[PDB]
Design an enzyme around this catalytic site. Structure first.
Site, PDB file in Angstrom:
ATOM      1  N   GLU A  35      35.850  50.567  39.935  1.00  0.00           N
ATOM      2  CA  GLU A  35      35.108  49.076  40.299  1.00  0.00           C
ATOM      3  C   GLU A  35      34.050  49.235  41.409  1.00  0.00           C
ATOM      4  O   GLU A  35      33.278  48.485  41.139  1.00  0.00           O
ATOM      5  CB  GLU A  35      36.120  48.326  40.838  1.00  0.00           C
ATOM      6  CG  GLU A  35      37.027  47.670  39.712  1.00  0.00           C
ATOM      7  CD  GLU A  35      36.419  46.540  38.932  1.00  0.00           C
ATOM      8  OE1 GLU A  35      37.066  46.050  38.284  1.00  0.00           O
ATOM      9  OE2 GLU A  35      35.009  46.639  38.577  1.00  0.00           O
ATOM     10  N   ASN A  46      28.120  37.910  37.866  1.00  0.00           N
ATOM     11  CA  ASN A  46      28.339  37.838  36.477  1.00  0.00           C
ATOM     12  C   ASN A  46      27.578  36.864  35.925  1.00  0.00           C
ATOM     13  O   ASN A  46      27.855  35.570  36.147  1.00  0.00           O
ATOM     14  CB  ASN A  46      29.858  37.871  36.034  1.00  0.00           C
ATOM     15  CG  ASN A  46      30.544  38.806  36.692  1.00  0.00           C
ATOM     16  OD1 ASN A  46      30.416  40.212  36.314  1.00  0.00           O
ATOM     17  ND2 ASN A  46      31.461  38.545  37.806  1.00  0.00           N
ATOM     18  N   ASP A  49      28.944  34.193  33.223  1.00  0.00           N
ATOM     19  CA  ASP A  49      29.995  33.047  33.606  1.00  0.00           C
ATOM     20  C   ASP A  49      29.832  32.399  34.901  1.00  0.00           C
ATOM     21  O   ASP A  49      30.727  31.669  35.435  1.00  0.00           O
ATOM     22  CB  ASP A  49      31.414  33.618  33.287  1.00  0.00           C
ATOM     23  CG  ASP A  49      32.243  34.152  34.412  1.00  0.00           C
ATOM     24  OD1 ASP A  49      31.383  34.879  35.151  1.00  0.00           O
ATOM     25  OD2 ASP A  49      33.463  34.112  34.752  1.00  0.00           O
ATOM     26  N   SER A  51      30.259  33.588  37.898  1.00  0.00           N
ATOM     27  CA  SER A  51      31.317  34.107  38.771  1.00  0.00           C
ATOM     28  C   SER A  51      30.772  35.425  39.553  1.00  0.00           C
ATOM     29  O   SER A  51      29.689  36.035  38.768  1.00  0.00           O
ATOM     30  CB  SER A  51      32.764  34.416  38.182  1.00  0.00           C
ATOM     31  OG  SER A  51      32.650  35.307  37.393  1.00  0.00           O
ATOM     32  N   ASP A  53      32.052  39.199  41.675  1.00  0.00           N
ATOM     33  CA  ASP A  53      33.094  40.251  41.955  1.00  0.00           C
ATOM     34  C   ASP A  53      32.752  40.755  43.365  1.00  0.00           C
ATOM     35  O   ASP A  53      31.691  41.068  43.596  1.00  0.00           O
ATOM     36  CB  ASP A  53      33.087  41.320  40.817  1.00  0.00           C
ATOM     37  CG  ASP A  53      33.303  40.998  39.498  1.00  0.00           C
ATOM     38  OD1 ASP A  53      33.922  40.224  39.050  1.00  0.00           O
ATOM     39  OD2 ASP A  53      32.538  41.819  38.753  1.00  0.00           O
ATOM     40  N   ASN A  60      37.358  38.607  41.405  1.00  0.00           N
ATOM     41  CA  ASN A  60      36.749  37.903  40.943  1.00  0.00           C
ATOM     42  C   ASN A  60      36.706  36.238  41.282  1.00  0.00           C
ATOM     43  O   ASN A  60      38.071  36.110  41.540  1.00  0.00           O
ATOM     44  CB  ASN A  60      36.692  37.954  39.121  1.00  0.00           C
ATOM     45  CG  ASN A  60      35.638  36.892  38.870  1.00  0.00           C
ATOM     46  OD1 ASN A  60      36.136  35.811  38.431  1.00  0.00           O
ATOM     47  ND2 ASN A  60      34.518  37.299  38.485  1.00  0.00           N
TER      48      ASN A  60
HETATM   49  C1  LIG Z   1      45.377  25.947  35.091  1.00  0.00           C
HETATM   50  C2  LIG Z   1      46.398  26.412  34.188  1.00  0.00           C
HETATM   51  C3  LIG Z   1      46.590  27.936  34.300  1.00  0.00           C
HETATM   52  O1  LIG Z   1      46.522  28.245  35.725  1.00  0.00           O
HETATM   53  C4  LIG Z   1      47.185  29.389  36.213  1.00  0.00           C
HETATM   54  O2  LIG Z   1      47.240  29.864  37.414  1.00  0.00           O
HETATM   55  C5  LIG Z   1      46.225  31.334  37.562  1.00  0.00           C
HETATM   56  C6  LIG Z   1      46.631  31.885  38.780  1.00  0.00           C
HETATM   57  O3  LIG Z   1      47.823  32.389  39.093  1.00  0.00           O
HETATM   58  C7  LIG Z   1      46.126  31.462  40.041  1.00  0.00           C
HETATM   59  O4  LIG Z   1      46.530  30.215  40.329  1.00  0.00           O
HETATM   60  C8  LIG Z   1      46.648  31.925  36.326  1.00  0.00           C
HETATM   61  O5  LIG Z   1      45.922  32.880  35.933  1.00  0.00           O
HETATM   62  C9  LIG Z   1      46.071  33.572  34.712  1.00  0.00           C
HETATM   63  O6  LIG Z   1      46.033  32.884  33.311  1.00  0.00           O
HETATM   64  C10 LIG Z   1      44.280  32.467  33.687  1.00  0.00           C
HETATM   65  C11 LIG Z   1      43.996  31.771  32.284  1.00  0.00           C
HETATM   66  O7  LIG Z   1      42.614  31.435  32.406  1.00  0.00           O
HETATM   67  C12 LIG Z   1      43.492  34.036  33.774  1.00  0.00           C
HETATM   68  O8  LIG Z   1      43.929  34.859  32.505  1.00  0.00           O
HETATM   69  C13 LIG Z   1      43.982  34.649  34.712  1.00  0.00           C
HETATM   70  O9  LIG Z   1      43.351  36.075  34.609  1.00  0.00           O
HETATM   71  C14 LIG Z   1      42.391  36.055  35.494  1.00  0.00           C
HETATM   72  O10 LIG Z   1      41.233  35.412  34.757  1.00  0.00           O
HETATM   73  C15 LIG Z   1      40.079  36.598  34.383  1.00  0.00           C
HETATM   74  C16 LIG Z   1      38.924  35.722  34.474  1.00  0.00           C
HETATM   75  O11 LIG Z   1      38.613  35.010  35.635  1.00  0.00           O
HETATM   76  C17 LIG Z   1      38.844  34.682  33.357  1.00  0.00           C
HETATM   77  O12 LIG Z   1      38.960  35.439  32.025  1.00  0.00           O
HETATM   78  C18 LIG Z   1      40.480  37.571  35.640  1.00  0.00           C
HETATM   79  O13 LIG Z   1      39.540  38.749  35.230  1.00  0.00           O
HETATM   80  C19 LIG Z   1      38.719  38.861  36.447  1.00  0.00           C
HETATM   81  O14 LIG Z   1      39.057  39.154  37.821  1.00  0.00           O
HETATM   82  C20 LIG Z   1      40.144  40.346  37.611  1.00  0.00           C
HETATM   83  C21 LIG Z   1      40.261  40.205  39.130  1.00  0.00           C
HETATM   84  O15 LIG Z   1      39.350  40.195  40.004  1.00  0.00           O
HETATM   85  C22 LIG Z   1      39.228  41.596  37.270  1.00  0.00           C
HETATM   86  O16 LIG Z   1      37.917  41.530  38.362  1.00  0.00           O
HETATM   87  C23 LIG Z   1      38.568  41.420  35.818  1.00  0.00           C
HETATM   88  O17 LIG Z   1      37.818  42.730  35.462  1.00  0.00           O
HETATM   89  C24 LIG Z   1      37.786  40.081  35.975  1.00  0.00           C
HETATM   90  O18 LIG Z   1      37.376  39.809  34.590  1.00  0.00           O
HETATM   91  C25 LIG Z   1      41.868  37.590  35.733  1.00  0.00           C
HETATM   92  O19 LIG Z   1      42.207  38.024  36.773  1.00  0.00           O
HETATM   93  C26 LIG Z   1      45.590  34.869  34.791  1.00  0.00           C
HETATM   94  O20 LIG Z   1      46.075  35.631  35.776  1.00  0.00           O
HETATM   95  C27 LIG Z   1      46.877  30.718  35.268  1.00  0.00           C
HETATM   96  O21 LIG Z   1      47.864  30.913  34.106  1.00  0.00           O
END
Ligand SMILES: CCCO[C@@H]1O[C@@H]([C@H](O)CO)[C@H](O[C@H]2O[C@H](CO)[C@H](O)[C@H](O[C@@H]3O[C@@H]([C@H](O)CO)[C@H](O[C@H]4O[C@H](CO)[C@H](O)[C@H](O)[C@H]4O)[C@H]3O)[C@H]2O)[C@H]1O
Ligand SMILES: [Cl-]
Ligand SMILES: [Cl-]
Ligand SMILES: [Cl-]
Ligand code: NA
Length: 130
Positions: A35, A46, A49, A51, A53, A60
């Protein structure tokens, strides 16, 4: 700062990362390598979107830290994203642990899937004393 490999491995070990929710230290090292190149000050906007990192694990802003400028974002680590740009990685480690408390674990980072999953990650910790 840019960590040297074995310095980072020992740092992460002291911070409780070895085996955290099943993730070996070498997997965390491989993640940080790909990373950020072990660089805590790194950022990456990014444009797709709106956002950003941050830091050594490139965490992110959409879910994990607050930078104010990411639309509809939340702050699950309860940190300003600035905290993820410190030379001291304690807050970044606490946030990485939070990330991996979610269902996908270490798979949250596509870079880990691309560069670390199902690979021999032993080299990342060889000779470091961990
Ligand atoms: C609002 C209803 C759902 O809310 C829940 O609470 C979230 C967390 O627990 C924090 O409160 C839950 O997140 C989980 O589901 C969501 C659904 O959108 C996401 O899938 C979460 O995963 C994160 O989302 C990715 C992108 O932001 C969106 O696609 C993140 O990936 C990015 O960050 C990573 C870590 O920095 C990494 O850098 C990746 O390369 C990036 O793309 C991912 O972490 C998921 O945990 C939700 O259920
Ligand atoms: Cl493994
Ligand atoms: Cl610092
Ligand atoms: Cl796996
Ligand atoms: Na050695």
């Amino acid at each position: 700062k840019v960590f040297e490999r074995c310095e980072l491995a020992r740092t992460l070990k002291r911070l409780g990362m070895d085996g955290y929710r099943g993730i070996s230290l070498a997997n965390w090292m491989c993640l940080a390598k790909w990373e950020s190149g072990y660089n805590t000050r790194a950022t990456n906007y990014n444009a797709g979107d709106r956002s950003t990192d941050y830091g050594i694990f490139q965490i992110n802003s959409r879910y994990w830290c607050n930078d104010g400028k990411t639309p509809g974002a939340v702050n699950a680590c309860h940190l300003s994203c600035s905290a993820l740009l410190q030379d001291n990685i304690a807050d970044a480690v606490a946030c990485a642990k939070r990330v991996v408390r979610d269902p996908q674990g270490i798979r949250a980072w596509v870079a880990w899937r691309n560069r670390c999953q199902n690979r021999d990650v032993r080299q990342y910790v060889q000779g470091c004393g961990v």
